[PDB]
């Protein structure tokens, strides 16, 4: 059988895919998430913070 990828496949998106939210996704908290702090977070003070009392 042909082992090469097929360029003649459909490159367009599929609207027939299910638009409804999937309830079978895992609801448990992921322990494999990165526990280290993120250095790439913005170090600059946010001007959009609420300036009122």
């Amino acid at each position, epitope marked *: *059988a*042909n*082992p*090469n*990828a*097929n*360029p003649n496949a459909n490159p367009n998106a599929n609207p027939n895919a299910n638009p409804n939210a999937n309830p079978n996704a895992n609801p448990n908290a992921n322990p494999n998430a990165n526990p280290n702090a993120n250095p790439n977070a913005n170090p600059n003070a946010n001007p959009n913070a609420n300036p009122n009392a």
Partner: nanobody
Framework: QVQLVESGGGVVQPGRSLRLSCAAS????????MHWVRQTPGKGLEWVAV????????FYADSVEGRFTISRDNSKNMIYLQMNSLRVEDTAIYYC?????????????????WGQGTLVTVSS
């Protein structure tokens, strides 16, 4: 400019394991299936294994079925061949061959582009 270079060659004792690696450049690696082809003097050219574009299917020759293992990493553009339980019959030059010059649905399985080849010697 398609260049295939192999590594991991050398000399090993019978019953031991060797790992050959093949580096590919000059083409979209993840769109083609790669082959390993064996050349033993006195026997001729011989096929070893094949892997699909995404690694879904892997087919090995009868002489290597159950001992060799082919894999690939599309993020590093490299082709591997784990040679477990080597025997004296496996002494040959191993080529990294790409399938077909271009994509043709009804014409695939011929080795358009070959690497320089690496030498694997099994002896004591």
């Amino acid at each position: 400019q398609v260049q295939l270079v192999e590594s991991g060659g050398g000399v090993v004792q019978p019953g031991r394991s060797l790992r050959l690696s093949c580096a590919a450049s000059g083409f979209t690696f993840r769109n083609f299936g790669m082959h390993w082809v064996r050349q033993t003097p006195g026997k001729g050219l011989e096929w070893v294994a094949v892997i699909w574009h995404d690694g879904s299917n892997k087919f090995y020759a009868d002489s290597v079925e159950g001992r060799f293992t082919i894999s690939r990493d599309n993020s590093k553009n490299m082709i591997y061949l784990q040679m477990n339980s080597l025997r004296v019959e496996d002494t040959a030059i191993y080529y990294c061959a790409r399938d077909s010059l271009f994509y043709d649905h009804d014409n695939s399985g011929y080795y358009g582009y070959w690497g320089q080849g690496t030498l694997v010697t099994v002896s004591s």
